Amino acid sequence: SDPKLTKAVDSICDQFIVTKSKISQLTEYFIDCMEKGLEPCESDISQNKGLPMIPTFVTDKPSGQEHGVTMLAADLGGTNFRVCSVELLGNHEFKIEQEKSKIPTFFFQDDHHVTSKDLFQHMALITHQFLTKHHKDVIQDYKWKMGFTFSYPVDQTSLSSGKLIRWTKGFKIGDTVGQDVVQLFQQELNDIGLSNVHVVALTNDTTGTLLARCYASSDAARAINEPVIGCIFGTGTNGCYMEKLENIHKLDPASREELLSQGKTHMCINTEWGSFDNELNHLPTTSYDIKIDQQFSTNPGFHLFEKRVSGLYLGEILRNILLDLEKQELFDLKESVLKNNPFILTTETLSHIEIDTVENDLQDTRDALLKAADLETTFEERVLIQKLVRAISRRAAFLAAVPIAAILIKTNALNQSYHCQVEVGCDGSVVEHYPGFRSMMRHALALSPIGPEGERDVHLRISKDGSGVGAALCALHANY
Amino acid sequence: SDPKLTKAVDSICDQFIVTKSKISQLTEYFIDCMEKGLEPCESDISQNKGLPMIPTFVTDKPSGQEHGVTMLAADLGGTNFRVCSVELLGNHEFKIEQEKSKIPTFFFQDDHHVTSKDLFQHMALITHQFLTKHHKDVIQDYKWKMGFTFSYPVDQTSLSSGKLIRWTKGFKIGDTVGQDVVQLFQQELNDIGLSNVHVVALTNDTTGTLLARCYASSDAARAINEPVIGCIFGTGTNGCYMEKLENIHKLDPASREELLSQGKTHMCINTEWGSFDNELNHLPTTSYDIKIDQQFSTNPGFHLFEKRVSGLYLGEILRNILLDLEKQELFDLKESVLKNNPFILTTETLSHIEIDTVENDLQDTRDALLKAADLETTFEERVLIQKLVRAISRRAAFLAAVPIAAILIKTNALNQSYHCQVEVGCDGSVVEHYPGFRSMMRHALALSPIGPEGERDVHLRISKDGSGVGAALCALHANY
Ligand SMILES: OC[C@H]1O[C@@H](O)[C@H](O)[C@@H](O)[C@@H]1O
Ligand SMILES: OC[C@H]1O[C@@H](O)[C@H](O)[C@@H](O)[C@@H]1O
């Protein structure tokens, strides 16, 4: 057990600690950033470094009794692209057929010039392949309504229109900025004969997650836990909530009065909390986070909260730590391929280390590091690597709780009735499959100002329903 | 408005308060009663007022891979009798067909003398009625193995044998005491042609619930939350857990060595915690608890913890409070039928009051009281009745957490690997359907010695699967 290396690792682990004080600071600061993000900004939305706090123009939570003919839904995530058909049967039930295809590496590389048409043509092709397989009879004649779930920040102008503010994650297609994604997708559908497919709704994967749970949640289960947040903890991270119309100052005052006159009280907000504190006024920052933001990410200066939490970057944090330990002549990389190989270590790699056992000489960690980049390790080295992984994930889980606590506090959602509890719809590989991530989230919520009495009233529920049901719900409401 | 009556209600509600100190006292006392209950009992088991702590002779938790032909299962609960067929498909999957029939009130009356044959004859008839509907073809030829779930204290002698120690809940059939329930059921089955149906297993509904969760829990879900307790919070209350063979001193020393030699380490214990502190050394007691125990219950002196928790008695507590308030000329019963009508107020009546809202003038409370005993009430009266209900249920929920915390402490269940949690399998109408009951249970667990950090490592999961799957598992293991 090399003391020099052990002491260096323990020192790094301590930098990833998030104390109760920090959570209270970040929680309260988050609320401040929400109140400012809800003011009318007069500057380039694509360059605004504040909390976007984007109105989604969704004002009605599904009742669970919605029913209609089969709807279509397309979901472009951070890693995969999904097309599906959703049949809303009513009474919280639905029939779904979906096809999940991974996003070609061509779109995440810049060596070859990529354009919006390259992307939406491909999406149109996958849509045709889906309809041919699951709806071979009525592919060309039927009047399909499609809900488009676009997992990126969009300057929403209505339920069925909005321009891309800025790519995130691994996308850097330049010409898509400032263009209405619904039109770009509809044009490529028309250009392959699917003009009968009408994209009538545009939603974020957060908005879809919230609407999906309001429908699928049983009448009894929902009377207990009312869904108040729809959030994502996968390749990226984000969340939404219902905001009072009066507090949404970005909205046209006349439009606000119109909605109020129609009986509307709230509108869902796409917080884009991955961009929480982009200027790093209070977020923890290590030497490794700076490299990820400034060297290894596609969106330098933006989405810094995400780059400390989401699964796209957690693995890259460990890589930069090993490189730092090697630069200090403390860790031998052997014949590995970590150098000049960003993102070779993925969050999936870390999941095999999070709960590996010494009883097996940390063999799961061994195979995971060899499979990822041929990094040979000793037992004492794996013991220390596990400490780093558990430090990275714990910080991600603790920071993940801050936006949830802030929203619940600002909206006074946890104390509204006797025996009142709230549900937070969670989707994503990390929250769903990373061992202990949800457990540690609840730990941070217990340390946040809502306290353990608040954590016990919050249900972080895995929403496997999906944004497709939510997108289908928006399509069912819209006109063809 | 009557201030006198309002002041009288606030004083009664304070009597139902359970403080953090009380929870710590009862938890520590419960562990003491467990340690004593595991010792060789020195008196007639039918009169022993201590914590029964009955060995169940179940020593193996299902792996989830069990598979076999269709099994039968009969479950005599506190209110209903259900017959079902369970097909264990393996890999945590199972197919179940069941028929739930209420236990005729005829068996809960003592005006006419009732005998065991009347009860088991009826149970045998329902078994025939079940097979006729779901297995009409091979009803008489097939060699059926049946697992019998008997939700009452049984001096278990083996997996397939045991004598009734004493009835509880509404049953008061005198000649059933001291008789083997498996034989009584098998004799009446033979007498109607179902001699090919062999009752090969006898289990308590607590044991069956625990075994069911060990099977149905996925490999991933169980690696996270290991089921360590199966408890019931319905018509009655009880729970079970795995105890080390060495600590079960009441068990035959030779039998322990045989089991230990076979690789066994624990044996499930039917605590019968409804009889926790029958002598009321520390359990809260009101003038109304005494009436239920000594006048309106079938088992005076026994099951006093249950008479404060389970749903069979909660409604009767409110009745005794309203009758007392009328005797004091503080509450007008009008032309109701509460007097001389034990158990006319049910816990289901209280469920409509727990979360009734003043914004609707407590209309649910109004309709619920009229339906129960034609008790007309004013708004101010319903406001006060709701305060009483919320005090009764909270005491039941806080007391309900004590046995769970004690078992977890004595067994050191929370001392596990990283990110390891435990599951408590919960079944019953109260824990499942009474508003807020589980929410308040988790609060008391946070006040117990395990603290809020322990409640977050404990998952009270509603196991609606049932003891049928658990009984079928014991039948699959046993020989025909
Ligand atoms: O996929 C999770 C989140 O990733 C972020 O980069 C996007 O801006 C969000 O719209 C999305 O919900
Ligand atoms: O049905 C729940 C519980 O009720 C109690 O009255 C019995 O003594 C227990 O054996 C049973 O498990």
PDB file of N, CA, C and O in Angstrom, chain B residues 199-223:
ATOM      1  N   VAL B 199     -52.989 -31.284   2.038  1.00  0.00           N
ATOM      2  CA  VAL B 199     -52.431 -30.119   2.721  1.00  0.00           C
ATOM      3  C   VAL B 199     -51.058 -30.518   3.254  1.00  0.00           C
ATOM      4  O   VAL B 199     -50.953 -31.278   4.220  1.00  0.00           O
ATOM      5  N   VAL B 200     -50.002 -30.005   2.624  1.00  0.00           N
ATOM      6  CA  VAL B 200     -48.639 -30.441   2.903  1.00  0.00           C
ATOM      7  C   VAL B 200     -47.798 -29.358   3.550  1.00  0.00           C
ATOM      8  O   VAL B 200     -46.619 -29.604   3.850  1.00  0.00           O
ATOM      9  N   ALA B 201     -48.358 -28.175   3.792  1.00  0.00           N
ATOM     10  CA  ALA B 201     -47.605 -27.083   4.388  1.00  0.00           C
ATOM     11  C   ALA B 201     -48.543 -26.211   5.209  1.00  0.00           C
ATOM     12  O   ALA B 201     -49.701 -26.008   4.834  1.00  0.00           O
ATOM     13  N   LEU B 202     -48.030 -25.703   6.328  1.00  0.00           N
ATOM     14  CA  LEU B 202     -48.762 -24.799   7.207  1.00  0.00           C
ATOM     15  C   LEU B 202     -47.857 -23.617   7.515  1.00  0.00           C
ATOM     16  O   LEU B 202     -46.740 -23.801   8.008  1.00  0.00           O
ATOM     17  N   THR B 203     -48.332 -22.411   7.215  1.00  0.00           N
ATOM     18  CA  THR B 203     -47.547 -21.204   7.415  1.00  0.00           C
ATOM     19  C   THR B 203     -48.443 -20.090   7.931  1.00  0.00           C
ATOM     20  O   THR B 203     -49.662 -20.100   7.735  1.00  0.00           O
ATOM     21  N   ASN B 204     -47.817 -19.118   8.584  1.00  0.00           N
ATOM     22  CA  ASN B 204     -48.494 -17.894   8.978  1.00  0.00           C
ATOM     23  C   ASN B 204     -48.419 -16.896   7.831  1.00  0.00           C
ATOM     24  O   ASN B 204     -47.506 -16.943   7.002  1.00  0.00           O
ATOM     25  N   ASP B 205     -49.390 -15.982   7.792  1.00  0.00           N
ATOM     26  CA  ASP B 205     -49.420 -14.991   6.724  1.00  0.00           C
ATOM     27  C   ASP B 205     -48.205 -14.076   6.754  1.00  0.00           C
ATOM     28  O   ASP B 205     -47.872 -13.472   5.729  1.00  0.00           O
ATOM     29  N   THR B 206     -47.527 -13.967   7.896  1.00  0.00           N
ATOM     30  CA  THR B 206     -46.267 -13.237   7.928  1.00  0.00           C
ATOM     31  C   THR B 206     -45.177 -14.011   7.196  1.00  0.00           C
ATOM     32  O   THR B 206     -44.505 -13.469   6.312  1.00  0.00           O
ATOM     33  N   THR B 207     -44.977 -15.279   7.565  1.00  0.00           N
ATOM     34  CA  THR B 207     -43.988 -16.107   6.881  1.00  0.00           C
ATOM     35  C   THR B 207     -44.259 -16.175   5.382  1.00  0.00           C
ATOM     36  O   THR B 207     -43.331 -16.065   4.571  1.00  0.00           O
ATOM     37  N   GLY B 208     -45.520 -16.359   4.990  1.00  0.00           N
ATOM     38  CA  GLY B 208     -45.825 -16.451   3.572  1.00  0.00           C
ATOM     39  C   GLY B 208     -45.502 -15.172   2.827  1.00  0.00           C
ATOM     40  O   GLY B 208     -44.994 -15.207   1.704  1.00  0.00           O
ATOM     41  N   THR B 209     -45.780 -14.024   3.446  1.00  0.00           N
ATOM     42  CA  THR B 209     -45.463 -12.749   2.815  1.00  0.00           C
ATOM     43  C   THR B 209     -43.960 -12.585   2.624  1.00  0.00           C
ATOM     44  O   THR B 209     -43.509 -12.106   1.576  1.00  0.00           O
ATOM     45  N   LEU B 210     -43.166 -12.983   3.620  1.00  0.00           N
ATOM     46  CA  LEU B 210     -41.716 -12.854   3.510  1.00  0.00           C
ATOM     47  C   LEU B 210     -41.164 -13.763   2.420  1.00  0.00           C
ATOM     48  O   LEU B 210     -40.352 -13.334   1.592  1.00  0.00           O
ATOM     49  N   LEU B 211     -41.571 -15.034   2.423  1.00  0.00           N
ATOM     50  CA  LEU B 211     -41.105 -15.957   1.395  1.00  0.00           C
ATOM     51  C   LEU B 211     -41.504 -15.477   0.005  1.00  0.00           C
ATOM     52  O   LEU B 211     -40.743 -15.630  -0.958  1.00  0.00           O
ATOM     53  N   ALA B 212     -42.689 -14.872  -0.116  1.00  0.00           N
ATOM     54  CA  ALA B 212     -43.154 -14.416  -1.422  1.00  0.00           C
ATOM     55  C   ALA B 212     -42.246 -13.328  -1.977  1.00  0.00           C
ATOM     56  O   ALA B 212     -41.936 -13.321  -3.173  1.00  0.00           O
ATOM     57  N   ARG B 213     -41.800 -12.405  -1.123  1.00  0.00           N
ATOM     58  CA  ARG B 213     -40.953 -11.320  -1.605  1.00  0.00           C
ATOM     59  C   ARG B 213     -39.558 -11.811  -1.965  1.00  0.00           C
ATOM     60  O   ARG B 213     -38.953 -11.301  -2.914  1.00  0.00           O
ATOM     61  N   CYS B 214     -39.034 -12.800  -1.240  1.00  0.00           N
ATOM     62  CA  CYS B 214     -37.729 -13.345  -1.594  1.00  0.00           C
ATOM     63  C   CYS B 214     -37.750 -13.966  -2.984  1.00  0.00           C
ATOM     64  O   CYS B 214     -36.721 -13.991  -3.668  1.00  0.00           O
ATOM     65  N   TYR B 215     -38.909 -14.463  -3.421  1.00  0.00           N
ATOM     66  CA  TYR B 215     -39.017 -15.072  -4.742  1.00  0.00           C
ATOM     67  C   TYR B 215     -39.245 -14.032  -5.834  1.00  0.00           C
ATOM     68  O   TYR B 215     -38.548 -14.031  -6.854  1.00  0.00           O
ATOM     69  N   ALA B 216     -40.220 -13.141  -5.638  1.00  0.00           N
ATOM     70  CA  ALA B 216     -40.624 -12.216  -6.690  1.00  0.00           C
ATOM     71  C   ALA B 216     -39.641 -11.074  -6.905  1.00  0.00           C
ATOM     72  O   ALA B 216     -39.654 -10.460  -7.977  1.00  0.00           O
ATOM     73  N   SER B 217     -38.793 -10.773  -5.928  1.00  0.00           N
ATOM     74  CA  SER B 217     -37.847  -9.677  -6.083  1.00  0.00           C
ATOM     75  C   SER B 217     -36.783 -10.040  -7.110  1.00  0.00           C
ATOM     76  O   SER B 217     -36.134 -11.084  -7.006  1.00  0.00           O
ATOM     77  N   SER B 218     -36.605  -9.172  -8.102  1.00  0.00           N
ATOM     78  CA  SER B 218     -35.613  -9.405  -9.142  1.00  0.00           C
ATOM     79  C   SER B 218     -34.217  -9.546  -8.538  1.00  0.00           C
ATOM     80  O   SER B 218     -33.953  -9.139  -7.404  1.00  0.00           O
ATOM     81  N   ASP B 219     -33.314 -10.143  -9.319  1.00  0.00           N
ATOM     82  CA  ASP B 219     -31.936 -10.296  -8.865  1.00  0.00           C
ATOM     83  C   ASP B 219     -31.304  -8.945  -8.558  1.00  0.00           C
ATOM     84  O   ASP B 219     -30.548  -8.810  -7.588  1.00  0.00           O
ATOM     85  N   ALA B 220     -31.599  -7.933  -9.374  1.00  0.00           N
ATOM     86  CA  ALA B 220     -31.032  -6.609  -9.143  1.00  0.00           C
ATOM     87  C   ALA B 220     -31.712  -5.916  -7.969  1.00  0.00           C
ATOM     88  O   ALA B 220     -31.044  -5.352  -7.095  1.00  0.00           O
ATOM     89  N   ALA B 221     -33.047  -5.952  -7.931  1.00  0.00           N
ATOM     90  CA  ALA B 221     -33.778  -5.307  -6.844  1.00  0.00           C
ATOM     91  C   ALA B 221     -33.458  -5.947  -5.499  1.00  0.00           C
ATOM     92  O   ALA B 221     -33.402  -5.258  -4.474  1.00  0.00           O
ATOM     93  N   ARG B 222     -33.259  -7.266  -5.478  1.00  0.00           N
ATOM     94  CA  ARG B 222     -32.970  -7.944  -4.220  1.00  0.00           C
ATOM     95  C   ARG B 222     -31.525  -7.747  -3.782  1.00  0.00           C
ATOM     96  O   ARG B 222     -31.251  -7.693  -2.578  1.00  0.00           O
ATOM     97  N   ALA B 223     -30.592  -7.649  -4.733  1.00  0.00           N
ATOM     98  CA  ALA B 223     -29.217  -7.318  -4.377  1.00  0.00           C
ATOM     99  C   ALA B 223     -29.149  -5.964  -3.688  1.00  0.00           C
ATOM    100  O   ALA B 223     -28.245  -5.719  -2.881  1.00  0.00           O
TER     101      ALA B 223
END
